[PDB]
Design a protein around this ligand. Structure first.
Ligand SMILES: [Zn+2]
Ligand SMILES: [Zn+2]
Lengths: 67, 144, 148, 257, 97, 115
């Protein structure tokens, strides 16, 4: 759905690192380099962004219930 | 089938097999921690198998306290070869195979499904036939 | 007193067939004087031992050795009876079997003493004249100390 | 029958990380300090959430869950504030809670990211760790989200939202000298970052007389508490728990005698 | 041959009796012909039982199901009463019969 | 529906005593301490500290069931040394140790910043 804050295993803040991760992937960095640049060292944190799927963008395509 | 349905299974059986070997030596604090989980313990810490240079209890020595009352049982470990009974070391068991329990104490040998499992003449079967249902229930719970 | 067996043994073997236990090795030892064959399992990391090591082995019913029962309990505050602490390596166990060579009419001339030290075993073969002090289901202390 | 005297060396100290070594102490002492780092350290986190309007595609309790996990700067007033259970007032008061208000409506066509910066607190001392921005929900044009929240004082035992630390690294005896773990093949195990032995050999020789000491630490804060104040509050909380145990034990001893 | 060697209770040796049985009971066993007659009757009954078993159990299958484990209970009696195999016993065989 | 509230590991409602002292009749000079709403954080500490006392013959802790929040600590001491006194001494020892550790850690922190 949406990027979850507080990586499950340890609790490190990963809810603020999704947009920066996407930007790093979009411009130059590979996934590993982007994760290293974001400071996600423990693989529990790296799998948190790496495996994330942002369904929030897909859910925003539909018109809202109230205009 | 005049066998027990209930036996030591899964984690407890593997940990018993690893726990009973000769190499298992337990320091003072570990022995104190383990003994409090013994429901039938009389509160008297046994003398360690090794006294010097440092006190070190053995897995069999602690497991002997779990054995209720005075149970006599003889089993064989899964890895026990058939050469030992024929040649020498029949009662020495260089691989520490076979099982001998005398006077409710695990004298020697490594336990497995052949001893604590569901089989005729198993150690738990002997405990039930000798002591009773309540004492065997306590034996099960203490082992676990 | 309270002594059962006193001798100095020679380590002739360590791993005759193979190694089955990481922390425990088996000492195949031969004795001076009484010519007493010995097999013994000894913790290795705690008490290292190599081939051809002079070690004095003592079998005692009690550690105090003044002639009183030890009631088989572990208390660290048991210093006041002046425990026999001249040995580096001390074990505690019971005799579980005593074999012999007697056949009906004739008496046993050689005995084998089997002791389980809470899982570690020792076999002690030799003439019955000095080995008669062992009794089945009797508490035993093993005392060990290397020699130069 | 008395305390050994521990010493502390601190190797690395940043705004996010603290690396220190505790020497000359029991294994259980170090382990319980590590456990208190996670569990018993008080911290301020959102616990009471009320949503007025929520047109987002995420359901109400989803947004409340995301809000509760947002860290809040608790470096100073977490000690001054009191647990709501122990507080005299009913519901919530400023002496027992901090009020948060969020009011976001997406009017432009471009999707608007509702972040932690949108949280508005009554007190300037607690900020949702924004001196990037923790994302709460994304709003499409026409969607709206208005809610009121109160932040309480709690610790890790209650809920993980009150965990003040990221992964707390604990390590003792990096060179395996006590043999607390036995490597079937020592040569294939990577050496620890605190290893004191040369590359040629694998492990230190066995030490029969040794006991666990010189416990290596690495406490990584979530930003809600400064990582040194995490250790200070952990020590203070454990001491307070032990002192309360002392008081109760003394009272029981006098009552029974 | 092995059956007789294991179950006959040969009292003629007079030396093995002194080692296994107490010195007092050896003279009673040897002197009294009633003891010897009753022991021979016991052995004859056991031989008849052996023949009955061989009729009942062809294929020589000695593994049988019985209520109480006599060997384990004998061993329990040994351990409870601190029986020393190295010493002669005071148990009179006629009392056993 | 059967999930216990969050405040069952530390909070004491009405009725429970924080620590309960029961003597052990099996052996002389042994006591059983039942600590309500506590976990291994305190039990392991107490067990480790008690073993330092040369007058403590037995010391340990256990959690009878993880779903419940209770600790049973069994202490046995030598004659003429009550186990309750041993527990009190261990707790005071821990107070002193923790205070000294905090003091030194604060000194180290202050030295690390601008030092
Ligand atoms: Zn993580
Ligand atoms: Zn209030």
């Amino acid at each position: 759905m949406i990027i979850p804050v507080r990586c499950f295993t340890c609790g490190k803040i990963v809810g603020n690192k999704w947009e920066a991760y996407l930007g790093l992937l979009q411009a130059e960095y590979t996934e590993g380099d982007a994760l290293d640049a974001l400071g996600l060292k423990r693989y529990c944190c790296r799998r948190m962004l790496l495996a994330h799927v942002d369904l929030i963008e897909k859910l925003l395509n539909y018109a809202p219930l109230e205009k | 089938s005049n066998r027990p349905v209930m036996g030591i299974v899964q984690d407890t059986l593997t940990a018993v097999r690893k726990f009973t070997k000769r190499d298992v030596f337990l320091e003072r604090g570990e022995v104190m921690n383990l003994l409090m989980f013994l429901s039938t313990w009389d509160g008297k810490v046994p003398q360690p198998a090794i006294l010097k240079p440092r006190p070190l209890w053995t897995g069999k020595q602690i497991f002997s306290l779990i054995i209720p009352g005075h149970i006599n049982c003889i089993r064989t470990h899964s890895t026990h070869p058939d050469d030992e009974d024929s040649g020498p070391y029949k009662h020495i068991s260089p691989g520490d195979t076979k099982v001998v329990v005398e006077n409710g104490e695990l004298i020697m040998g490594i336990l497995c499904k052949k001893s604590l499992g569901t089989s005729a003449g198993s150690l738990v079967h002997i405990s039930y036939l000798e002591m009773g249902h309540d004492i065997t229930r306590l034996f099960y719970s203490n082992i676990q | 007193a309270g002594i059962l067996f006193e001798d100095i043994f020679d380590v002739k073997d360590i791993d005759p067939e193979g190694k089955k236990f990481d922390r425990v090795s088996r000492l195949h030892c031969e004795s001076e004087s009484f010519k007493m064959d010995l097999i013994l399992d000894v913790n290795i990391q705690i008490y290292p031992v190599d081939l051809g090591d002079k070690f004095r082995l003592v079998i005692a019913s009690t550690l105090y050795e003044d002639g009183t029962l030890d009631d088989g309990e572990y208390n660290p505050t048991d210093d006041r009876p002046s425990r026999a602490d001249q040995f580096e390596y001390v074990m505690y166990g019971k005799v579980y079997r005593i074999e012999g060579d007697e056949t009906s009419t004739e008496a046993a001339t050689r005995l084998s003493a089997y002791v389980s030290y809470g899982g570690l075993l020792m076999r002690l073969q030799g003439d019955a004249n000095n080995l008669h002090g062992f009794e089945v289901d009797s508490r035993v202390y093993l005392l060990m100390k290397k020699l130069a | 029958p008395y305390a050994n005297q521990p010493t502390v060396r601190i190797t690395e100290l940043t705004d996010e990380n603290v690396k220190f070594i505790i020497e000359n102490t029991d294994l259980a002492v170090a382990n319980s300090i590590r456990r208190v780092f996670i569990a018993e350290v008080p911290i301020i986190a959102i616990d009471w959430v009320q949503i007025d309007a929520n047109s987002s595609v995420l359901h109400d309790e989803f947004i409340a869950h995301r809000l509760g996990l947002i860290p809040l700067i608790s470096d100073d007033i977490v000690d001054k504030l009191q647990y709501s259970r122990d507080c005299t007032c009913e519901e919530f008061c400023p002496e027992c809670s901090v009020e948060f208000t969020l009011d976001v409506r997406c009017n432009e066509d471009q999707t608007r990211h509702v972040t932690s910066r949108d949280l508005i607190s009554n007190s300037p001392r607690v900020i949702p760790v924004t001196s990037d921005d923790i994302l709460i929900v994304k709003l499409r044009k026409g969607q709206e989200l208005r809610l009121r929240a109160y932040a309480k004082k709690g610790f890790g035992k209650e809920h993980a939202k009150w965990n003040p630390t990221a992964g707390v690294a604990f390590e003792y005896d990096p060179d395996n000298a006590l043999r607390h773990t036995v490597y079937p093949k020592p040569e294939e195990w990577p050496k620890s970052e605190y290893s004191e032995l040369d590359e040629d050999e694998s492990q230190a020789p066995y030490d029969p007389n040794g006991k666990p000491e010189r416990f290596y630490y690495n406490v990584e804060s979530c930003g809600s508490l400064r990582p040194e104040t995490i250790v200070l509050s952990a020590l203070s909380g454990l001491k307070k728990k032990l002192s309360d145990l002392q008081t109760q034990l003394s009272h029981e001893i006098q009552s029974d005698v | 041959k092995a059956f007789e060697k294991k179950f006959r209770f040969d009292y003629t040796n007079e030396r093995a009796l002194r080692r296994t049985l107490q010195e007092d009971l050896v003279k009673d066993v040897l002197s009294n012909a009633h003891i010897q007659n009753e022991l021979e009757r016991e052995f004859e009954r056991m031989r008849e039982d052996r023949e009955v078993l061989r009729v009942i159990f062809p294929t020589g299958d000695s593994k049988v199901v019985l209520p109480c484990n006599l060997l384990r209970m004998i061993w329990n009696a040994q351990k409870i009463f601190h029986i020393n195999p190295r010493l002669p016993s005071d148990l009179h065989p006629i009392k056993v019969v | 529906m059967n999930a216990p509230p969050a405040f069952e590991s530390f909070l004491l409602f009405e009725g429970e005593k924080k620590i309960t002292i029961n003597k052990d009749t099996k052996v002389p000079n042994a006591c059983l301490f039942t600590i309500n709403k506590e976990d291994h954080t305190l039990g392991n500490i107490i067990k480790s500290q008690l073993l330092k006392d040369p007058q403590v013959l037995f010391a340990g802790y256990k959690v009878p069931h993880p779903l419940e929040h209770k600790i049973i600590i069994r202490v046995q001491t030598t004659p003429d040394y009550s186990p309750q006194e041993a527990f009190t001494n261990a707790i005071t020892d821990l107070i002193s140790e923790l205070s000294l550790l905090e003091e030194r850690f604060r000194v180290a922190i202050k030295d690390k910043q601008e030092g």
